[PDB]
Structure formats: structure tokens, C-alpha cells
């Protein structure tokens, strides 16, 4: 599914991301926009042979099992395909683990480079939340 902006904000809010580890909801929506273009189905191979999955481009090196990243972990205890679902529950839950892991939302390169230090509240402007 390709979310609309506010639709994603609503979904991430209901699943508990707003202010999660101190990151306002606009940070999460912004991250999703530049990670996946709000597309739950997005996949992108990494140079090390891992792949990033779903609305928040969660990486099989650490966080999910895709069957083809040798020597990786699965800290979210999920198949990576769980992260491509139109229902974002798995993605959000996994994102909570990631952001709790010491590095905050720096774990998402698109967040660091396109959202961090910007007016991320813009990403939830207009939304009924
Ligand atoms: Cl915000
Ligand atoms: Cl959802
Ligand atoms: Cl932090
Ligand atoms: Na893995």
C-alpha cells in the first residue's frame, strides 16, 4: 500500500510512534517519506547483501529474517515480508525496537539526512490526529 501522508501519520499515531523515544510523529512520517515514498512494499538491497524492507526500510542485517542475509540477526523476530504488509503494525513495532537501540532515529539514513534538524511538524500539518 502507498499511504497518503496523513493516513500514515494516523496509522503511526495509533500504533504508538508519536513522541516514541522523544521523536514527534512528524519525524516518523518524514522518515517514511524519504525511506519508502510511503510505500509498504518498498525493498532496497544494501551493498553488504542485506535488504531494507517496508515503509521504514528496516534492514535484514539486524532486524528481520529474509532468508538471504547470512550471519545476520532478527531482533524484531519477524520475517522481513511482515514489513511489507499494508498494515504497518510489524513495521512500527520493529521501528520502536530500532529507535530504542542507542542510536535513535539516526538508524534511518533518510531521517538523518532529510528530517533531522528540519521542521518535521510540517509532515503532520493538516492531519486530523
Ligand atoms: Cl511533529
Ligand atoms: Cl496500519
Ligand atoms: Cl534519541
Ligand atoms: Na536477518
UniProtKB/Swiss-Prot annotation:
The keyword ATP-binding does not apply. GO terms for molecular function: beta-N-acetylglucosaminidase activity; identical protein binding; lysozyme activity. GO terms for biological process: cell wall macromolecule catabolic process; defense response to bacterium; defense response to Gram-negative bacterium; defense response to Gram-positive bacterium; killing of cells of another organism. InterPro entries: Glyco_hydro_22 (IPR001916), Glyco_hydro_22_CS (IPR019799), Glyco_hydro_22_lys (IPR000974), Lysozyme-like_dom_sf (IPR023346). SMART domains: LYZ1. It is found in: Secreted. Keywords: Allergen, Antimicrobial, Bacteriolytic enzyme, Disulfide bond, Glycosidase, Hydrolase, Secreted, Signal. Substrate binds at residue 101. It holds the Pfam family Lys. Its EC number is 3.2.1.17. Residues 1-129 form the C-type lysozyme domain. Its main location: secreted. It is an enzyme of class 3 (hydrolase). The active site is at 35, 52. Disulfide bonds join 6-127, 30-115, 64-80, 76-94. It catalyses: Hydrolysis of (1->4)-beta-linkages between N-acetylmuramic acid and N-acetyl-D-glucosamine residues in a peptidoglycan and between N-acetyl-D-glucosamine residues in chitodextrins. GO terms for cellular component: cytoplasm; endoplasmic reticulum; extracellular space. In the egg white and polymorphonuclear leukocytes. It comes from the Eukaryota. Belongs to the glycosyl hydrolase 22 family. Monomer. Lysozyme C is capable of both hydrolysis and transglycosylation; it also shows a slight esterase activity. It acts rapidly on both peptide-substituted and unsubstituted peptidoglycan, and slowly on chitin oligosaccharides. Lysozymes have primarily a bacteriolytic function; those in tissues and body fluids are associated with the monocyte-macrophage system and enhance the activity of immunoagents. Has bacteriolytic activity against M.luteus. This is Lysozyme C.
Amino acid at each position: 500500500k502507498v499511504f497518503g501522508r496523513c493516513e500514515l501519520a494516523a496509522a503511526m499515531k495509533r500504533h504508538g510512534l508519536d513522541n516514541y523515544r522523544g521523536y514527534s510523529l512528524g519525524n516518523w512520517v518524514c522518515a517514511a517519506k524519504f525511506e519508502s515514498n510511503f510505500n509498504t512494499q518498498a525493498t532496497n538491497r544494501n551493498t553488504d547483501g542485506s535488504t531494507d524492507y517496508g515503509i521504514l526500510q528496516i534492514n535484514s542485517r539486524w532486524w528481520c529474517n529474509d532468508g538471504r542475509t547470512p550471519g545476520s540477526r532478527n531482533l524484531c523476530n519477524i520475517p522481513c515480508s511482515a514489513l511489507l504488509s499494508s498494515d504497518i503494525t510489524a513495521s512500527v513495532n520493529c521501528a520502536k525496537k530500532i529507535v530504542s537501540d542507542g542510536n535513535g532515529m539516526n538508524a534511518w539514513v533518510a531521517w538523518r539526512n532529510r528530517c533531522k534538524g528540519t521542521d518535521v511538524q510540517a509532515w503532520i500539518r493538516g492531519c486530523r490526529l
